[model samples]
Target: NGTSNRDWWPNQLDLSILHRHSSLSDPMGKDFNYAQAFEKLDLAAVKRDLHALMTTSQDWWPADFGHYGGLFIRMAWHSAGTYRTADGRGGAGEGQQRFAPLNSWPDNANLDKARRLLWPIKQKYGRAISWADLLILTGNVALESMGFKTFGFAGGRADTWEPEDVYWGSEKIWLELSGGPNSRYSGDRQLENPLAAVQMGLIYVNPEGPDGNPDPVAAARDIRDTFARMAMNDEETVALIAGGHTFGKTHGAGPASNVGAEPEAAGIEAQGLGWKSAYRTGKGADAITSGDEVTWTTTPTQWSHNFFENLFGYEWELTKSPAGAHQWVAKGADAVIPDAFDPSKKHRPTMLTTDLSLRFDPAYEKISRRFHENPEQFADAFARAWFKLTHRDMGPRARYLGPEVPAEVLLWQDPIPAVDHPLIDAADAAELKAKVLASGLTVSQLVSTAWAAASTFRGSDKRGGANGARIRLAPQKDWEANQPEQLAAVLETLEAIRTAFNGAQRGGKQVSLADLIVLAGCAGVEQAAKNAGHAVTVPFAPGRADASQEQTDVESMAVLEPVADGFRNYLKGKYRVPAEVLLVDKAQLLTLSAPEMTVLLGGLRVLGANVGQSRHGVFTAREQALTNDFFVNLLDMGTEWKPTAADADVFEGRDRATGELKWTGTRVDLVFGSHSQLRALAEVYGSADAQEKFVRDFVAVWNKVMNLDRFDLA
Candidate 1:
């Protein structure tokens, strides 16, 4: 009776991490090609319709200022603002905002109306334009119609059918304090790694202040910290804040307690809309979002310098919104700003604590002052920063589609140089392979170096990969996980080969260090398989270019360094989470299925590729041979395992009959056999008929990792 292992052992390690978005779950089906589908879209028609939709306010949810530009802009901003540079997870990548969690987050209040408003646009476009693309495209159109010139638009984001399993925070309740025990922060004022938001349900820091304390300087610190984590510098942060606030007003006509349940918790009769407010009218004048009832500029429907004009023009004092939320108000006759709903009435313009931070913080104030002095520079800065904010999570420029993809290659896209000469032919590849195998680098050295170069890729943002051979650059070369000294020796040996190979060529032939490094690993893998009597050929593609240190940003590349890499069996230090959990997390970032991860781990162990050449998971007596011995020996019945000590992560396996230790291993090694789900996969590879299958599968995944960053090839 085959059943789910999770039903019996509820606390067991869930091996299903490998198959989160199965093909069966995708309603678009496996044959749907989003890139090709998006090609059919009439870009001009969509934009013209969006321009028309902005001023045509629906009666159910009337647009503020008789225009939906501000609402659409906020919708796009919140969708992308959740992105943090640490893991590169939360963003507008998959249109996950349409599903649970994101749709109902406190920071995303009333955004349901934004998406609902775009329904007609989505319905008209159908499969050609995805919800993900439409959401962002609407924002670009909004800005353009409001007299703002955008950088550009690229529309190739494919929508996901289900919600992504992202780690938003540890808290169960919404809007909890940043320093609360259940929150992400520890003892320091710094927010925890991989979490950009200060509070549980917020996108960034609390708008009122950090923990709702309205000290501008303190608020500035939180703002900088969170924005930097989002990969925005001080100047870009200021531009985004200033530019986004230029055309919008916050809603808080009455107490927010009168608002009904969010989209997810609302009653079925509400017709998918949520946040039903009980305040007067609750459609135009009495709407409540963020609980700060203030418009920053007098020209709320058009883009202007009024945001900065109001920021520096008058003296501001701390005040509370009508809903009792902390805010600031400018007290002067010149402070009177036009109302969004009633043109006849005028109210004093107000600013949020975060808005005031840009005025008081020294660094932000300087940038703000510069922008105010030069409106052209301000417009260009805001345009470029807005482009980066919306597209940072979209990965490479190759993934971008449509006519608006800029011809200029931005550094943040991890650009690679174009190849002028032809790539290495089959004969050249064979000769290079033979030379690499005879270069005196061991199987462990070749395979580990190649893995180090390629495994830096995180599918989350499509950065890092063997394409540019950035492993030879500063930040990657100095990473501890790469075994710096050993890597340098391997690179030096490969460089000598590269020089000799290219120097001997007279017919305009050339080879890059990036291609040479990967070729060496391919040669090593083929030899290892032959040694085990499999005689397999590891596939190699040779278009990878070597990026110079100048092309790479050292500070930005440093963040890509791994704290723990499960593929290499490397851990820099003890972490709050268990080592095996980190292993699965790394696997997920690599976009590996469970079977792919299991096969690679089994092969790497026998190839002697562990960090420091440690004997922890090397279950095979015949090392350096690509065999199924790791899985075979791990499941052996004669072995009995035990922890080395009372509180130890290491385990010792002994011969049951003789009481003699056979091998030592880590939790990562033993889990493959102990867990029922992973063990099922191990058993298939460990069977008598599976030696050829294991070798074939291992080589397939190895080549997959080596080419993960080859977006140019796409």
Candidate 2:
């Protein structure tokens, strides 16, 4: 029942460097030596081990459910499905599906089998992996095993203590219930009425029978209500159902069950509930269902678009069942859906009334048509939807959500902004550049100060940029992102200029500290690039106003301070997400588009970054030289990624020619450098010899970043 600091880290990275002002946090402990760390534990290897365990087995029963791949996916599913975002209330996280209120639900009957299925892997590596995260990882693994192309893995979930909510209903409803045998709190499955079943996306107990009333509108609303709460779009919602329903069938009711479909005398039935035991293989004592005994797709064990194809392609008529479960069945004896991979596996392709509800709505029906036109897009949609399905509990804001997330969504913003205003004169500019070259600060040191100076306006808002640095000077420590290191560079560099100027008027009428950082950064890059044999003068501009600290909303000078460097973007007590896990995925945080982002990252890596937690795509020869090799490396599509640690988003790239490890990367780089869409431009840059052309892109984009606030129209 104990939790460790390792849980919040990405890829089990060293967490000692994180901020620890809050009581919930602790600074670097003796056990954690910052000096010796990294080469994080390999989750990729663990994932392969997990993947092997999930698919290599074949002994389990009922060929459709026997494989256990889809069942594991569903197990991961319902655990996450139970979560209600409204109060962070109820999602099956932290192995809750194995415990009291959560496990006790009739809906979760067979899920325990999955928990046992994964127990071996957990038992072997339990200390390193959480059961909650394993559930999600298993599904991600299974999805890939079904021959679907998807990212390898994303797992960093920590277990919760117990079922956050004791009842299936919201907190108020659960609180309102009295403690009695028949009370809603009794936890016996309760369908209660027709609308409740629809809202919960369950089938009506006796719909297809004489007492049935199939309301498409209510059921449609139920799906919308249930799925929308999970932040799924109409496309994603359909993707989940289309992908999920392709595997399992409605069990225990209709033609497949030995149990009478009639009202039971006791147990889950007499209580009158919706379907249960759909995910398990072995029959339960209280196994009861009132729907079709048929599979959702023709190839039940295989993954395909057959579900959506069947939903629109087939001619389905209402099934007249004596069990009272209402569903649609294809006409004639040929109506049976045969298992393509295994002919011995025989069953009619069945459609649950809930499954049929999707086609009834014209809006959703239109979406189905869209899927029919392009099978590839459907697979893509399902991959994304599956991610959302598994990650329901983890807030969407986690910096590196997964590898499937978009990186540079390529855009053509003025890579370098146009500056019409008069900038620093040649005589002063030349002297300033010469002075910085002589002064002794390194290129990386200069880049850091320059970035922090410009970062004055870098925030989630994206509206403000560079004005503060243009017009302000140091001592405005109020801005939270300004760390001690950045502050030191600001003071030392400014004073270095003051002394170098022999106490002359600092800017020749300029009040900008930001101008010095970037302009000097250009000078240093030019100096270092020349030293490294690349002749390049980084672009520079001047024309910014200076405002005194008093001009800021002097109420504690709050106006000057804004927040977020992304993961570390925090104000003392404000950040809710981990401040240590930085991801360059957000376009607004840096306010650079994907192409410009590529340019900027190259510039940072080239100009050099401070050691420890800096960008890592290239191996260092001289730190401050721009090269396009990293982009080329990722889009190479040949690189193999496997984390050395048990982290979610970290990985080491090995040189294929030489098995020795070459470089390291993160989700941010994967978004820009790997995916077909975002990394396309990256591919363009990487396709051939990238070094020469790489520096050219860097200069233009770096110029753009420097002039970001120097808008001609603004």
Candidate 3:
């Protein structure tokens, strides 16, 4: 219902007017509604900003939580975890997490902070995007930023104002369903509801533990039973575990034992682990006895198969911490009872008893071992499981979400109508141009953007592209950007595409966004070169139809999203390349011959197409000019290409006069100077007299790389 635009006045109580309280409306809250007002806000920009916030911010808890990304993902997880698989009741849709009884659910213990973290994003975009929508997007944006191509997300989840919205699936039921061992209260306790009991047991499955604990089988059975109640098959249960553990550590920042004066120090020295975590002791404690340190995966910010690898490979010994919590740890001198490990220590997270059972229990081990065998398999399984975990409670509101495709899997492409021809409007085209100008980015820089794009589409390299840009261009708290201006060129490339063919149509031919995106990027390079007083020739072609993804193989798609992106040798989504190693997988990303690749590198370095402080370039101020100096310097210069006396793999181009490090080279480039095969080609381009041939050689290879995968348009 729309509110009357009577030059509406704002009040702190205005929130009640837009709130939903089941079919029952409060008489006192009638007439002043925000549904329409909020609906009209700029959600698209909110999304961009959310992306920026999640990716850019290396905000609070960078050392412990990595970024708010993990917490935000956990926020979505806990919010959606409220779902009762029994009748599919409860969930984030009604925004019950904001109100409550439900808000104080112990399982959601520290999540309020997670919710609070979104306050700024909410305050800025709250009128349009609901708390429910913002909360969930924070999780996905965080996930996408860490390099898992996000699946579809939508924004119609309405906010609830009353606790009555949750009566059907009480907070007691959801909390108890978590099955905390200490508080074994169930909805059917002296009460009824076997489904609630089973659901709680299914997820809360802790029937066993170490020394001063319960037997493991019963707890495992409860876990299996809970999964069964949720209708998750065995494989799904396994995948869910793997996916859930992929990001964020279970322990906040303590080895837990480190806190509170050694427990046996018996509450003497009470320095808590700075932040408030479940592991940390509450106020007025004698010692820092409330914390524990343990992470689920090796890489906390990223989604990777490392969880499976760490679990299956490491010999985790079950033991107790000073906090008296039980978890598993590696069997080595480096490992110790966390509580007893020394109040001053540097270490990673430990495994819980639940993680222990995955190894000891037969059925669980079978699945766990299978995942470890091919961690690739685990990623696919985890993605599907995560989606299920997040979406199970959406109910009819799920229809608002778009189709699923790993957001980054095909970043260069988008969906088109199934009809013979698909087109974008003049406004969309013009808007793209506006974005290009807004950024002060050069269009030809898109040439490098396109090369990065083509690498993702080439063979098994499979997964990088404009997807990184889609989220990175926006900003939040930190943005933890790999290259700050990296996506600017890509966006301008899209603008280039719009400028040349906004109203154009394909005549009975299928063309993909990939074809157009890559083509525009290549064309931008040509324009940049032509403008820079250099002769340029470029190739362009069409008919790469936009790719569409189906949600059917949720299990399959999960595997593809976060697996190794062969480009840059990045498996865990870490894209930062040190200036030392230079280009680890450049030759592979381009798939060019060593000779062609050598010439190509010369152009990239001189053109200053580098994003994060490029290395080993010939020209100092000649940035963005087509030049032959990269080879000219390498061939004519007199500097020893000796491996660093300290790090041999890291070869340095040391200055003879200064004896200071001047430049570095990757093994790929090192080969160009050392190997007879690679050196023969470099020799021709190396001569100052042959600089003209170098220009022609450079121009041809640059065009080939940009237009690599496309068929010859000639």
Top of the candidates by lDDT: 1
CA lDDT for candidate 1? 0.88
Candidate 1 lDDT for residue 4:
68
Overall lDDT per candidate, in order of appearance: 0.88, 0.53, 0.50
| lDDT for model 2 | 0.53
Model 2 agreement with the true structure over 127-207: per-residue lDDT tens digits: 456677678778777777776765334454545443332224332331122343433222333322102221222211222
Encode model 1's per-residue lDDT on 1-714: one tens digit a residue.
777666777666665666888898888868889888899889999999999999999988898889999999999998898898998888887888889889999889889999998999899889999998888998999999999999998888888888776778788779888656676877768677888988888888888898889998999999999999999999999999999999878998899889999999999998777899999988688889889987989888898988888899888989999899999999764546888778788888789999999999999999999999898899999999989989998887778999998787777877777778777888999999898888788889999999889888987778888888899999999899899999999999999999998989877789999998899989889888877877788888888887877778888887799989877778898887778888888898898989999999999999978899999989998999999999999999999999998648889999999999999999889989887778999999999999989999999999999989887676
- State the TM-score for model 2: 0.45
Determine the C-alpha RMSD for candidate 2 after optimal superposition of all C-alphas. Answer: 21.6
Enumerate residue pairs that collide in model 1: none
Give the per-residue lDDT of model 3 (tens digit) for 278-303. Answer: 44343211122213345666467777
Name the better of 1 and 3 by lDDT: 1
TM-score of each: 0.97, 0.45, 0.44
Worst 10 residues of 1 by lDDT: 9-18
